[PDB]
Amino acid sequence: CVVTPVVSHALLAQLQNVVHEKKLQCTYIHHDHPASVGSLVGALGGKVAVLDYPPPV
RNA sequence: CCAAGAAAAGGACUGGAAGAAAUCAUCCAAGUUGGGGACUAUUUUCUGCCGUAUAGGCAG
């Protein structure tokens, strides 16, 4: 069977708040032309936060 | 049969100028290292002639 993933609006928007409030390890991903990708990406100025948990090597 | 499949970040460049770290000084006093002792054994090197000769040369 072929699978196509898609990003959840509700889930990503919550993560942007939790990492800054709970002080989690994170970084930022840039998007050119934020208005062409979506409501949230535009509101965030083209910078979106993600979790960063590398292995202890 | 992998958030699957493909991919050239490149080209150029003058950090410079100038300067005083200085004056002073008490480490001292005492002191028990000692007592005992096998380098030779199953070793290998003897016996002679010439030569003034413990020199130098020789047979067995």
Distance CA A50, CA A15 (A): 8
DSSP assignment letter at A23: T
Query: Nearest CA to A35 among A27, A23, A43, A24?
Result: A43
Experimental method: cryo-EM
In angstroms, this model's resolution equals 3.5
Residue A8's nearest nucleotide, by CA–C1', is B3
Query: Could you identify the residue written with the tokens 């970084």?
Result: A27
Backbone angles phi and psi of A33, in degrees to 5: 50, 60
Q: Is the CB of A7 under 7 A from strand B?
A: yes
Contact A28/A47 with Cβ under 8 angstroms? yes
**A56 CB neighbours strand B below 7 A:** no
Q: Going along A1-57, which residue ranges are E strands?
A: 26-30, 47-51
